[PDB]
Structure formats: C-alpha cells, structure tokens
C-alpha cells in the first residue's frame, strides 16, 4: 500500500474491482504508458476538498 511520492493526473477510469473489502479503480495515468496502470482506492483519487468543491459548484 506504499504510495509513489509524486502527484499524478487521471486520464481514464478503466475498470472496477473489490479487493479485501475495498473498491479499487484501474487508472490510466495521464502522460504515462498503459503498462503503468494501477489499481487505486477512492481515497488516492479524490481528496475531501475535491468532493466539497464539486458539491458546492453543482
């Protein structure tokens, strides 16, 4: 569960699964090859600030 130290941009959400009781999304990362795709839980993809701003703007 160790994170890459960097910050990255989601290009596409490709697939969904459940691992150990947690939903994960297969992410294609912008600027990176398809071989770099990773499975991530929601918390890695979405901050609380993201959720609130998205809500307040809708």
């Amino acid at each position: 569960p160790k994170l890459d130290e960097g910050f990255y941009e989601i290009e596409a959400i490709r697939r969904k699964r459940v691992r150990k009781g947690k939903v994960q999304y297969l992410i294609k990362w912008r600027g990176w090859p398809e071989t770099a795709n990773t499975w991530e839980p929601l918390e890695n993809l979405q901050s609380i600030a993201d959720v609130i701003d998205a809500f307040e703007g809708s």
Binding site: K2, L3, D4, E9, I10, W29, N44
Partner: peptide, 8 residues
Amino acid sequence: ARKSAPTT
C-alpha cells in the same frame, strides 16, 4: 491524485 508504487 496519488498512485500506488508497484510491487517489487
């Protein structure tokens, strides 16, 4: 977004 480092 944050990313998980690959398995080694």
